[PDB]
Amino acid sequence: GVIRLYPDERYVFRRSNPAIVGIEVIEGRIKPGVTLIKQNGQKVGVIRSIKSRDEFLQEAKKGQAVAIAIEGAIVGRHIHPGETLYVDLSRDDAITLLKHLRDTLEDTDIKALKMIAKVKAKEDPFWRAI
Amino acid sequence: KEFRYRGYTLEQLMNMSLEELAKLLPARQRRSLKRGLTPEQKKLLRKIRLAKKGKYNKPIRTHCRDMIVLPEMVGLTIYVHNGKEFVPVEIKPEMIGHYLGEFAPTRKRVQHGAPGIGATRSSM
RNA sequence: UUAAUUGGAUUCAACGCCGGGAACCUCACCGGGGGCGACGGCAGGAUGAAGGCCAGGCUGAAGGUCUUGCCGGACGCGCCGAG
RNA sequence: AAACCCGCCCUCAGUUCGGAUCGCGGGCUGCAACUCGCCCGCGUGAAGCUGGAAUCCCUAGUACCCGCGCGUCAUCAUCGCGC
RNA sequence: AGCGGGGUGGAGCAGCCUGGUAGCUCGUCGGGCUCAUAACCCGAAGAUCGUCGGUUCAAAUCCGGCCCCCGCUACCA
Ligand code: MET
Ligand SMILES: [Mg+2]
Ligand SMILES: [Mg+2]
Ligand SMILES: [Mg+2]
Ligand SMILES: [Mg+2]
Ligand SMILES: [Mg+2]
Ligand SMILES: [Mg+2]
Ligand SMILES: [Mg+2]
């Protein structure tokens, strides 16, 4: 999953403990309890809860806006508005997706995974060779 | 911008006896010429003159690294042994008075690698 | 490092030591070219072995080899042992 | 033989200290001096202003300072052995 | 978002106040000592003080806007 923070001040509803901010999905699927990382890989924390409205949600698909309440992330030093966030991926999970679960893969998922591999191709040559 | 060796053009150098020319070279070359040429240098000079006459249209390869360049040798190409191969030399007018071996290096230029074990007191 | 930068010696008791101040030689290294098998025997050999040369090519230079023909007369590495 | 002695110039300065490095020219040995020899004339003028922790030799015609002979050797001694 | 602290060799700290040298410890490279290695002793390299400007005879110091992180509470989709 890859998302981008709104450059809008309105979506920010709480700064720290927890960080509550709206989000639109660019690619992939957001799930609770998934770690998010930046290009440099700082641990912004683990998504604690997601809510499209006052109601409690479970997951968000493509073209859906949702306010995320996350832990360990602070606006400014840890996260900036209008900055693009990436879901941290496990190489074993990537191998399983590319080999075992190749039936349940679509355009947005493959685009997200490919660009995530391109971005993560910085330290381990495994993502460089994809 | 023309070539002159002691105030003499190339043509004036061509029409000179060996004894006359030796008065213009440095002391070492004058002494070497005054003692005459070795037989190998005689054969090499014969081949050079034959080539100048228009015969012997073949590469000129030699072992005589101590031959002195003469004005009549200008314009040819000579292959001088350097220890393992014959390297080509194209004679220019400003080469008059030098040994052939001066134009055929015998050692390869040095590019140092990383110092090995035993290069310092603490590496032993 | 290099085609080669020949090799021995590593505390006192290796390092102006090998009497080692190497232009050739020394020389043992690198590139290239030539030469050598007493003595036994096997093919061969006066109808001439083994060997040597005027000139000219190949060649760094060379009867080393080839071209071109002139020599000399009894041994013979083309082959096996041996030195 | 030199260190040594007498007279004149320089007077504490990278200099009239130091002479490495390089240019041009003249010579000797040798079959051959470019790689790779030694000598001479003019020119040029680098680092160096007394040396950290460590460490060597020496008890009398000895140590320090100064030159010379022989060996090696066609030419070449900042070396060895002697004076 | 608002309040509050601080930027100094490869690393970790002093040095401000009271201007006028950039010092400490560790690490890196080289040398001594020992039969040899560790311990130990010496030397060298490495920052011209986060940026701009002002102040001052002269600023690592006095001062600012400016780059960054740090501290705090506020902030419930
Ligand atoms: C909060 O009220 C809710 N709007 C969160 C989603 S933001 C698109
Ligand atoms: Mg000697
Ligand atoms: Mg010598
Ligand atoms: Mg030799
Ligand atoms: Mg002087
Ligand atoms: Mg020379
Ligand atoms: Mg002085
Ligand atoms: Mg030690």
Does residue A50 lie within 7 Å of nucleic acid chain E, judged by its CB? Answer: yes
> Is the previous residue joined to A18 through a cis bond, with omega within 30 degrees of 0?
yes
Nearest to B105 by CA among B75, B78, B65: B65
**How far, in Å, from the CA of B105 to the mean position of ligand 4?**
18
d(CA B70, C1' C6) / Å: 38
CA distance A112 to A106: 10
Written as six digits, the tokens of A74 are 């602070």
Does residue B83 lie within 7 Å of nucleic acid chain C, judged by its CB? Answer: yes
Provide the H-helix boundaries in A8-129.
Answer: 91-95, 107-120, 125-129
For ligand 1, atom 5, the nearest C-alpha belongs to: A67
* Helix, strand or coil, per DSSP, at residue B92: coil
Domain hosting residue B20, numbered range: 1-124
Nearest to A3 by CA among A53, A57, A67, A90: A67
CB of A51 within 6 A of ligand 1: the answer is: yes
Task: Give the experimental resolution in Å.
Answer: 2.8
CA dihedral A33, A37, A43, A46 (to 10 degrees): -10
* Helix, strand or coil, per DSSP, at residue A81: coil
Written as six digits, the tokens of A17 are 């403990």
Q: How far is CA A67 from CA A2, A48, A77, A83, A100, in A?
A: 15, 11, 20, 16, 33
Q: How many residues does chain A have?
A: 130
Does residue B106 lie within 7 Å of nucleic acid chain D, judged by its CB? Answer: yes
A51 nearest nt, CA–C1': E77
Q: What is the largest CA-CA distance in chain B?
A: 68
Task: Return the residue matching tokens 């032993």.
Answer: B124
Contact between A70 and A46 under an 8 Å Cβ cutoff? The reply is yes
**Residue A116, exposed/middle/buried by CB under 10 A (0-12, 13-18, 19+)?**
buried
Q: How far is CA B113 from CA A52, B87, B117, B119, B123, in A?
A: 65, 28, 12, 12, 16
Contact between B3 and B93 under an 8 Å Cβ cutoff? The reply is yes
Written as six digits, the tokens of A115 are 């660009």
CA distance B98 to B74: 12
CA distance B33 to B46: 16
CA pseudo-torsion sign A115, A119, A125, A127? negative
A 10 A CB-CB count for B44 gives 20
Contact between A32 and A48 under an 8 Å Cβ cutoff? The reply is yes
Number of domains forming the structure of chain B: 1
Contact between B36 and B18 under an 8 Å Cβ cutoff? The reply is no
CA distance B49 to A74: 93
Amino acid identity, position B81: H
Cβ partners under 8 Å of residue B45, min gap 6: B37
Provide the H-helix boundaries in chain A.
Answer: 91-95, 107-120, 125-129
Query: Which positions of chain D lie under 7 Å from any protein Cβ?
Result: 25-35, 37
Task: Return the residue matching tokens 């460089």.
Answer: A128
* Helix, strand or coil, per DSSP, at residue B27: helix
CB of A65 within 6 A of ligand 1: the answer is: yes
- Out of A51, A54, A57, A68, give the residue to mutate to test ligand 1, the one with the largest number of ligand atoms within 8 Å of its CB: A51
**How far, in Å, from the CA of A54 to the mean position of ligand 8?**
72
Q: How far is CA A86 from CA A2, A30, A122, B72, B117, in A?
A: 5, 10, 15, 81, 49
Contact between B91 and B106 under an 8 Å Cβ cutoff? The reply is no
Written as six digits, the tokens of A85 are 């966030």
Written as six digits, the tokens of B92 are 């220019």
For ligand 1, atom 4, the nearest C-alpha belongs to: A53
Residue A47 — left, alpha, or beta (φ > 0 → left; ψ -120 to 50 → alpha)? beta
CA distance B27 to A124: 71
